[PDB]
Design a protein around this ligand. Structure first.
Ligand SMILES: [Mg+2]
Ligand SMILES: [Mg+2]
Ligand SMILES: [Mg+2]
Ligand SMILES: [Mg+2]
Lengths: 373, 373, 373, 373
């Protein structure tokens, strides 16, 4: 039987431990080692220090063990049983939130392991591939001055993007400033392009979100992502009845339970689990099933490294409705270079890899360079 | 204009990191330091390494800061605004679970500070005390042999306990054993005593749960605690339609959002937030209001140190319906001795402290002896 | 301990006791006296004679005591416990309506007392301030002839108001007269200004309200306040499904219970408790929490004296979503001059006061002048 | 063309203003005077000072007039239009609570006038009498010692009471005492008697309430009255799903709106409007219709003077299901002697009066003796 022999956690960071940090300038990656010398790689988009503690923690009580402790000596191929072992065994400190992000990383690595052991791409183990490539949308953080975004938008257009998302930075702060940035990007993109917006909850309330949506209705937005916090399922529901554009959310949620509540109560058009936060590939499978039962489109969230990319691609290839992925752009060495043989965006699409497991080879020299721990 | 100058996390432990650990043999306490020399003390009943990481974490992104970074230089008196700053600022890594445990500890410390600063017990800041002492119930892990339990029951009877709870260990596993443990405890306690069971999710399904509910209807139990996992709200509701006894749960939940769902969808009679997990005193207050609006009894959960105890007593004293508290006991030096002037169980009841803040003086010798960090 | 020693009720009136009276030409204010010589000031926007009787009443039965009787000798700092004491103790004559207005006045004065005793502004005790000033909207009673409102609107525009509300007088009487007044104010204000209307229930029925709303839809009204009586929650709900503009109501309601029913059943966009009617600052806190849970915007109602103003400002400063206040305009000496150091509207905003308690000094000479009792 | 010329409020009292007072030692009665010499009598079971203020109040605003000002010069026969004029005209200070108590008194007086004017008993104006007498139940405050109660039960048995209610005093406080009081009363009355309890909200929560419901299932109580406060409709509904006995409440509510909510959301078996609080005879009629539509039994609440008694009998006589009335007794001269020709309890029953109006002649000597104003 294939036995787990070690779990290795690697904190990677680009700026200083006291300095500021954007999305994608740090990472936490896990290597699961087995007795046959198959290593699986996963990651979590979460706080690296916290994820590390969830994995490396000792026993606190019978329902509170660090994840490494529960998994050394275990049968790596039995992925779902191990998911349930980690979930129960770390339940006191996990169950929702950071502990589930830790589980996601390990689960992803276990799927990598199984694919390599069995000699098949993960998409085969998930049921088989429906497509040889996946359509992407590109994302950017918008420039403070509205008309300075034309250069960014045009830069994505000749890259081949037929769909774009923007938000963060100073997005949501001024109704007039919000209007002027959305103006300058639709004009720069033309009337064929899909344009969607992400507020990262910055419109705060239901009323401010609805007023802003009718004013931006002329620009024909494809969706409006996280106008408010996903805590208020009532606020989402109420926005759905009163807005014309699609509503998207869900990226910060963890486990099938939170997704089941979101999907059925928010009346969102689009649900966006992150494969490295939600519980991993195993959990994402169950979340997809719930979405399908409810007529909700699942478009995964994610921007970290090639590990998230390879996991998300393998997952979507295996979905009948896996027709759209987020492909975010960064100059960070962690995004561009950590995975040596990284899948590349190419004229509107990313190709599906058929290599065993997740098809990940890590840049070992780069690990040595940015290793905090 | 009291400013926060430092947040000091103390990991305490009795056995070694590689060794076995039960409820109460480790703790994570937080000291919040101000520029006027007053210190506030809080704790989190969770994994000490994870809570430490939540507090000490650097910036990862705009919604992902460790708590300490968000709080140095802030006005300590502005407790609810600071709760929201932490909730928002750590949202990506927190929101539910481990991050909220870390928030709970700090929140508790901030209340302790405000009390000292204002020269009044926390119960006055919470609205004023309804009682001079609080009725307690006692808890035990039952011995494997059913006939061995008569000495533990009697031991609690000698202390003055009019109400007792048992669970954990071999409770839950075998239905015949379960019956044999419940047999010996009602007989040893007599018909006078309130007797409650806590299965810690070990009956697994409502089908297995409902069978024992008709079986032990002759033993007249006060409540049945966590028959299944609180993840299945439907399983709880279904139990409430066919069970004679009262249903209790909720100890592992975090934020008013999880409690609002549990309270309204589970039809449980009793909700059990832990003050050191749910979000702290600030959040506990909101959870109390929701419980009141829905006719649900709030009996807090908690067993760690005198910190949890002092916070729970100050809370319940200020609640119109704050009429019952868990008083679990251990010989563990972290429970008995960390808080110097610790409130004592006394013939059925724990007295309400009127000292300013939470009335907590820490055994500084003991801290040095048992600190891991 | 800080003990209540007296409760002093002052009926102030501008015109004769047999003459007509507009909004703001009479007031009832309460002074709560303590043994440390701290006086707290509150008021109720209600009938002065009735409020006075609720406070000064003797015992009628065990659940029917005047409020003064329940509070002399009590511990003033224990505000929420005293709220519950008054609520239970006056339940037979109070519970809803005028008795709750009486409670509001006292509760406001108790918060004033606590702030002074502790040496902090009330906004600190409510959780801390989110903003140094609060955006206001101005209100006026419209002139009978439509085009005579231009002078009023322009008068508010150079005052700095970016948002205006009008109603009362002859508002709601004629569909053509209603249309012509709304015409002449939007033209006078321009297309940038927020313009909202208040009918004070004068459209009577659901059908008349809906027909009038589509005809005024061109003028882009920010909200429609109280089209019908808030008794018919069904009428509000039905209007929400069929109207484009925001629906506001709630000003006449009392206690969390009426607000919970309104908020959840009316599907109103905006809920408007009056801090001097709803149960006071204590109750308003619980009403805010309910609004937040349901995605409903809370915009306080109020126009009486500086006492209501100072209470509402302290409250909103302490709300994460306290972004808008009603600032009504009157020439009445009670509005302009009763509070000596009154906060002033200044170019679109009112500044937040940091003085201890509510920051209220009463014009004692003015009290002597208009004192009926 | 009968015109109202005066409304005369009479505050009556037995002990002094500073002294103790129980149910029935004060009253507030209203005389409505017409220009044709006929006088109508009503009362309000509420605080006499507050009801007086509600009636005698000046104008405060357009929706805030004292009732007397709204009614002088009006056509007394137009009772329902006058109810609506008062409801609307005092809405700001009334709407629920004390203002509706003041309306109730006047409404009752107007019915008394119409009856005299038309030469027919009020029961004819209400639709016509179904019965010549009404079955009564009797009430007592139980003596502290459980064994002392056997003489009171027997005392009521001697009078002819086939149905009895007890509560107040020390009822509610201690569960063992509660059981010991209920023990002695079923035994003293025998199995024949209908026995009911009224806790006056003193069981506080449904958890405490439901335990006694299984406990006293052997005593076969006719109903359990107001176990908790009627504010928590959810608490009532939850009690109805698990209680053997019938649930009663509603005595403190005002207007068809509160009753509609209580009746439909509480799942109570019995609703108890007080004719002198709920809105008067006019409103009671509407509340009866709602109760009928929902299968809810209406048993009126009331203990004050012969005014309440004469109004309640005239009401119930005209109801198809007006088959049970509360007949509480006191030695108090306001109860026994204010109404000269007072209807008498007679061997189980109170006879129906056919005199025009309410058949009320007031003891004018007694008025002079006990008037406060
Ligand atoms: Mg997003
Ligand atoms: Mg438990
Ligand atoms: Mg209004
Ligand atoms: Mg009663």
């Amino acid at each position: 039987v294939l036995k787990i022999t070690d779990i290795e956690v690697l904190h990677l960071r680009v700026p200083a431990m006291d300095a500021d940090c954007e999305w994608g300038e740090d990472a936490v990656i896990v290597k699961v080692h087995t007795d046959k010398g198959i290593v699986g790689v996963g990651e979590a988009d979460s706080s690296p220090l916290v994820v590390q503690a969830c994995i490396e923690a000792p026993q606190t009580n019978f329902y509170c063990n660090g994840l490494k402790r529960l998994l050394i000596g275990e049968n790596a191929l039995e992925i779902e049983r191990l998911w349930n072992k980690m979930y129960w065994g770390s339940n006191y400190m996990g169950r929702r939130g950071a502990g589930i992000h830790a589980i996601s990383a390990i689960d992803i690595a276990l799927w990598d392991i199984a694919g390599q052991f069995y000699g098949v791409p993960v998409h085969t183990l998930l049921g088989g591939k429906y497509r040889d490539k996946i359509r992407c949308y590109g994302t950017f953080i918008p420039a403070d001055k509205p008309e300075d975004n034309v250069a960014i938008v045009q830069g994505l257009k000749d890259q081949g993007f037929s769909s774009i998302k923007f938000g963060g930075g100073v997005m949501g702060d001024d109704p007039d400033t919000d209007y002027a940035i959305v103006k300058a990007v639709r004009e720069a993109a033309g009337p064929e392009m899909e344009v969607q917006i992400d507020l990262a909850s910055k419109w705060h309330t239901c009323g401010h979100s609805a007023m802003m949506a009718k004013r931006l209705e002329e620009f024909n937005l494809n969706w409006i992502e996280e106008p408010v916090l996903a805590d208020s399922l009532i606020s989402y529901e109420k926005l759905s009845r009163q807005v014309s554009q699609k509503i998207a959310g869900g990226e910060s949620l963890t486990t099938r339970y939170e997704f089941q509540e979101f999907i059925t109560k928010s009346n969102a058009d689009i649900v966006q689990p992150d494969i490295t936060r939600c519980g991993g590939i195993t959990e994402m499978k169950k979340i997809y099933d719930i979405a399908q039962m409810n007529g909700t489109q699942l478009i995964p969230h994610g921007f970290s490294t090639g590990i998230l990319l390879h996991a998300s691609v393998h997952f979507l290839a295996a979905c009948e409705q896996g027709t759209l992925m987020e492909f975010s752009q960064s100059s960070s060495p962690l995004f561009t270079s950590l995975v040596k043989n990284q899948l590349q965006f190419d004229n509107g699409f990313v190709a599906v890899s058929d290599a065993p497991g997740l098809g990940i080879e890590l840049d070992e020299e780069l690990i040595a360079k940015y290793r905090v721990n």
